Amino acid sequence: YIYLGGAILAEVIGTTLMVGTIICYCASFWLLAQTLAIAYAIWSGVGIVLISLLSWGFFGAIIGMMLICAGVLIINLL
Amino acid sequence: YIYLGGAILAEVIGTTLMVGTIICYCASFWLLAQTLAIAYAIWSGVGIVLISLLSWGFFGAIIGMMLICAGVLIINLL
């Protein structure tokens, strides 16, 4: 749901960031727990997307990006 | 390493299972930390196995699961 998506985004942000970093990580973990209480597969996909976003941010291949986009489209479809 | 992978699997199992649940989660986190102390790609790939194990434990679409697996393989490749 929207809340779950927000939690995933927060977790991704915490991962990108890395104390303050520790606090952020704890918050992300709490959000994930709240989201928790297939679904697991969806969560894994979201985590992968967050990791990809973090990598992109760090950077600033094309084929890899296209593959990721295709995977996201497939996930959206089902 | 193998020990790290085992710790990750244990953490995943604890997460799937779920106070007692909180204690289990804490134990899983501790195990993960112990396990902790390209490579990142390998870890991500392993994470997929842990997620699959957690899903199996929860159990006791297919196309979507296959697509997710393909995406994970692509990520591992690059």
Resolution (A): 7.5
Closest-approach residue (CA) in chain B for A52 = B75
CA neighbours within 13 Å on the CB side: how many for A66? 3
Q: How was this structure determined?
A: electron diffraction
Q: Rounded distance, CA B21 to CA B39, Å?
A: 31
Residue A52's SS3 state is helix
Which residue does chain A place closest to B59, by CA atoms? A38
Task: Say if CB B53 and CB B13 are below 8 A apart.
Answer: yes
The residue among B57, B58, B75 whose CA lies nearest residue B67 is: B75
Distance (Å, whole) CA A12 – CA A25: 9
On whether the CB atoms of residues A63 and B74 are closer than 8 A, the answer is: no
Contact present, B35 and B66 (Cβ < 8 Å): no
Separation in Å, CA B34 to CA A5, B1, B26, B57: 30, 11, 12, 23
Within 8 A of B75 by CB-CB distance, chain A residues are: 48, 52, 68
